[PDB]
Amino acid sequence: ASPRANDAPIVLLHGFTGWGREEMLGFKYWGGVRGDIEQWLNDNGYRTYTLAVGPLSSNWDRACEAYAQLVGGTVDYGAAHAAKHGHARFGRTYPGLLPELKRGGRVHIIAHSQGGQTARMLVSLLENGSQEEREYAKEHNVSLSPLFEGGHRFVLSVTTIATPHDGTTLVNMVDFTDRFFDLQKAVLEAAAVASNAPYTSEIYDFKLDQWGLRREPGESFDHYFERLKRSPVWTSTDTARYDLSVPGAETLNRWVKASPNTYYLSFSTERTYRGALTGNYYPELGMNAFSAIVCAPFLGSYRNAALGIDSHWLGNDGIVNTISMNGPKRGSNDRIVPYDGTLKKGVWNDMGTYNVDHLEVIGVDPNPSFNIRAFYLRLAEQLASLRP
C-alpha cells in the first residue's frame, strides 16, 4: 500500500563515464548487461528520462548542459565562466525533455558517481543562480542565461549513488592520467563484448564542443584519448579531473549547499574486505576486473596524514572511497542524517551502504547477488511518496 504523493518524472544522470540511449550501439549505461533501468521504471508507472552530458567536463559545464536538456534551448556556459577558462560560451541546442518545468513542474534526479556532484550544483544554480555571471553581465552588457538568475526550484529530490561528495584518492595514483583513460577503454570493451562487436565500431561522443575537441574521421579512440590527455579538458581546473580530487570536491562543497526545498538521498557502496594484520583494504571476489587489478589495491592502501586521509578512507567500491559517498562533509555544512523511516528535506538522508562495486550498481558489471531491479523499483517508490 504505497502512498504515492507525486507523479513527478525521473531523470537519470551518469558520472565521468556515460552516454545517451542512442550511443554504444544500444548498450545502456543505466542497466548494462542486466537490462534497461529506464524501461523498468517507465513500465512500472514512473515516467523516466536519461540525460547525457560531457563525461570528462567540469560539473559546472555538465550542469549547464543538463539545464538545456531539461527545458530546451542552446547550452550557455556563462559569459564570465567561458572568458575565465577560455572555451566557447555556447554549446549544443536541445529540444528539451521537460519544458513544463518552466511552468510549475517538478522533477526527481537520480545520479550515479560524479553525476551526484552535478545534480547538487544544478540545484544550487537553479535556486541562487550565479553572482559572478550576474555582475559580469552588467559590466559587459551581454545576455544572461536564466539559469544564473536564480529563483527556479523545480527539482524535488536528488539521489546520489556512489558519489564522491568528498572526492576520491584514485586521482593521486602516480599513473592516474593513463589509468583513467584505460578505464574509459575498459567500459568500451565491456559494451563491445555485450553486443558482440569490435570495440572499434562503438559510438561514444564525449561532447567537447566548447573546447573544439572531436574524434576525427578514422581516428581510433586510443589516438583520441592521447590527444585528450594533453588538452585543456585534462590540464585545466575546469575539468571532471579537478572536481574528482579531494581538494577539488572540497572547493565544490564550499558553495554548493543543500537546498531546504529539496530532498537529498545518498547511497554508499563498498566491495572490499579488511586485511587483519596490514589494516589495508582488498577487492572482494566478483569486483569488476579493471578495478580489482588497477584501482582497488591503491584505494585500499593510500594514506595521507597531512589531509586526514586515514584508515577510514581505505574501504572502497573499486573507484571511490566509501567514506566519501554519504554526503558532503569537507568544506560543507550540509547535515547528514541516517535513514530512520521518513525522508526529510534540506538534509542528506543516508540510505545506507550496499555491497556492490562502482559498476555493478548500474549493471555494467554482473553480480547475481544484487537484485538490481528491486533496488531501483524500491527507490522510485520512495521518491514517488514524497510530498511537494
- Residues annotated within the binding site for Zn(2+) are 61, 81, 87, 238
- Residue 332, contacted partner among Zn ion, Ca ion, none, CB below 5-8 A by kind: none
| CA 86 – CA 381 distance, rounded (Å) | 44
* b/e per residue 357-381 (b: at least 16 CB within 10 A): bbbbbbbbbebeebebeebbbebbe
Residues 246-275, mask of contacts with Ca ion (x by CB under 5 A): ------------------------------
Q: How far is the CB of 81 from Zn ion (least distance, A)?
A: 6
Distance between alpha carbon 119 and the CA centroid of its chain, in Å?
A: 7
User: Is-catalytic flag, 358?
Assistant: yes
C-alpha span between 96 and 101 (Å, rounded):
10
Q: Would residue 291 show up in a list of annotated catalytic residues for this protein?
A: no
Residue 158: phi and psi, rounded to 5, are: -130, 125
Q: Give the closest residue to 117 by CA, choosing from 248, 212, 19, 224.
A: 248
Going by C-alpha positions, the residue among 76, 13, 74 that lies closest to residue 49 is 13
Please enumerate, by residue number, every residue annotated as part of a binding site: 61, 81, 87, 238, 286, 360, 365-366
Distance CA 29, CA 356 (A): 16
Query: What number of chain residues touch Zn ion (CB under 5 A)?
Result: 2
Q: Give the 3-state secondary structure of residue 267.
A: strand
Query: Between residue 327 and residue 366, which ones bind Ca ion under the rule CB under 5 A?
Result: 360, 365
Please say which residue, 105 or 286, places its beta carbon nearer to Ca ion: 286
Catalytic status, residue 2: no
Minimum Å gap between C-beta 286 and Ca ion is 4
Distance between CA atoms of 1 and 277, rounded to whole angstroms? 49
Per DSSP bridges, beta strands 90-94 and 348-354 are unpaired
Pick the closer one to Zn ion by CB: 66 or 380: 66
Q: Based on CB atoms, which residue is closest to Ca ion, 284 or 334?
A: 284
The residue from 238, 270, 350, 360 that contacts Zn ion (CB under 5 A) is: 238
CB of 28 to Zn ion, least distance (A): 27
Q: What does DSSP assign to residue 201? A: G
Neighbours of 172 (CB within 10 A): 16
DSSP string, 279-298: --EEEPTTS-HHIIIIIHHH
Task: Find the binder of Zn ion among 38, 61, 65, 365 (CB under 5 A).
Answer: 61
Choose which of 72, 105, 146, 286 interacts with Ca ion (CB under 5 A): 286
Is the CB of residue 65 less than 8 Å from the CB of residue 91? yes
Which residue in 94, 367, 379, 383 binds Ca ion (CB under 5 A)? 367
What is the helix (H) or strand (E) element at residue 40, kind and residue range? Answer: helix 37-43
Q: For 50-100, what is the HEC assignment?
A: ECCCCCCECHHHHHHHHHHHHHCEEEECCHHHHHHHCCCCEEEEECCCCHH
Select from 60-68, 128-136, 137-145, 347-355 the region that touches Zn ion (CB under 5 A): 60-68
238 interacts with, out of Ca ion, Zn ion, none, CB within 5 to 8 A per kind:
Zn ion
Question: Tell me, what amino acid is at 382?
Answer: Q
Residue 65's binding partner out of Zn ion, Ca ion, none, with CB under 5 to 8 Å set by partner kind: none
Contacted entry of Ca ion, Zn ion, none for residue 61, CB cut-off 5 to 8 Å set by kind: Zn ion
**Is there binding between residue 76 and Zn ion (CB under 5 A)?**
no
Q: Which is nearer to Zn ion, 238 or 270 (CB)?
A: 238
Compute and round to an integer the Cα radius of gyration of the chain. Answer: 20
Among 36, 76, 317, 350, which one carries the catalytic annotation? 317
Min dist. Cβ of residue 367 to Ca ion (A): 4
CB of 271 to Ca ion, least distance (A): 8
Question: Quick one: which of 9, 56, 16, 32 has its CA closest to 356?
Answer: 32
Nearer to Zn ion, 61 or 76 (CB): 61
Query: Among the candidate windows 64-72, 101-109, 260-268, 286-294, which touches Ca ion by CB under 5 A?
Result: 286-294
Catalytic residue among 57, 58, 113, 124: 113
Q: Which residues bind Ca ion (CB under 5 A)?
A: 286, 360, 365, 367
**Contacts to Zn ion by CB under 5 A:** 61, 238
Residues annotated as catalytic are 113, 317, 358
